[PDB]
């Protein structure tokens, strides 16, 4: 097929005439061939089409990197991305960590909003790299020692207060 250039879908694809074909094959086998073809077409192409392709690719990869790619692509339908990230939430966290390591607007805001929706605090703090300190202080208002220590490390007025509180 690539080298060159159910009945109803075939008719539609014929009427259209590469993207449509891979989309149809993907839908038909929905598996390895499907995913491969869909991914290839999506790569060759790069409002509705883009979103559909991205969702398909992300789902296929999560079933079998792709997250960050799709995100950066779409950034350059917000609620849709919110739902996608909602589905993403351990692997998603790792991917996010990788992206942040690589870096060292809308995306950041959506991410913060989703994270805000131990674990939560850690995620928020990792993402922001002030909100962390506020959350910790609110929660505090063994656990005490850990919280105070974490705050002190993060800051490095507040330190003296924390030390005095731990000593009292």
């Amino acid at each position: 097929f690539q080298l060159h250039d159910i009945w109803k879908d075939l008719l539609c694809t014929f009427t259209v005439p590469h993207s449509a074909f891979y989309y149809q094959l993907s839908l038909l086998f929905d598996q390895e061939f499907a995913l491969k073809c869909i991914s290839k077409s999506a790569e060759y192409s790069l409002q509705d089409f883009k979103e559909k392709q991205h969702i398909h690719y992300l789902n296929l990869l999560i079933h079998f990197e792709v997250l960050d790619v799709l995100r950066l692509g779409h950034e350059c339908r917000t609620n849709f991305l919110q739902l996608l990230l909602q589905e993403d939430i351990d692997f998603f966290s790792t991917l996010l960590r990788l992206c942040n390591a690589h870096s060292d607007k809308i995306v950041d805001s959506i991410l913060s909003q989703n994270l805000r929706s131990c674990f939560k605090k850690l995620y928020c703090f990792r993402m922001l790299n002030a909100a962390a300190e506020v959350l910790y202080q609110y929660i505090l208002m063994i656990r005490k020692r850990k919280c105070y220590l974490m705050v002190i490390n993060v800051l490095s007025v507040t330190l003296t207060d924390l030390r005095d509180e731990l000593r009292g």
């Binding site: 960590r97 390591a101 850690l122 703090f125 990792r126 790299n129 220590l149 974490m150 002190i152 490390n153 993060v154 490095s156 330190l159 030390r163």
Partner: protein
């Protein structure tokens, strides 16, 4: 040096301990003869400290072992300026929760001889220390 080795009042013993620590940081029969020791380190005192230092160097020569050694080093610094600087230097060269706690305690704990030692190590210090701490915090966050 041989006479001092033969001798091994409290201040003198402390000085001897510091010298031994410096020598270990720089790095025979007496050392082998010198080699319970772990429990004393967690807690004659100069001797126990020196023995703890030697075990740490031995572990260093030999990832988890390195972490245990670093923890021991942090524990020693808390018990005790030059030592802290040497510890920081060791930490920078190496570059999870307990480690972060120790680093925090060290930052909380944090003259000419110390600066000279820092200059010798480099061949500003506090800033490098803060940077290293930030890096370690980032590493802990990533984990």
């Amino acid at each position: 040096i041989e006479s001092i080795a033969n001798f091994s009042l409290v201040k003198s013993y402390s000085w001897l301990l510091f010298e031994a620590s410096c020598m270990e940081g720089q790095k025979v029969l007496n050392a082998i003869v010198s080699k319970d020791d772990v429990i004393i380190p967690q807690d004659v005192t100069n001797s126990m400290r020196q023995t703890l230092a030697p075990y740490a160097v031995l572990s260093q020569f030999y990832d988890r072992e390195d972490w245990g050694q670093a923890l021991r080093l942090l524990l020693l610094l808390i018990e005790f300026h030059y030592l802290v600087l040497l510890v920081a230097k060791f930490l920078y060269p190496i570059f999870e929760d307990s480690v972060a706690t120790v680093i925090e305690v060290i930052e909380t704990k944090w003259s000419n001889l110390y600066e000279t030692i820092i200059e010798a190590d480099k061949s500003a210090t506090l800033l490098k220390n803060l940077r290293k701490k930030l890096n370690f915090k980032l590493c802990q966050a990533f984990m």
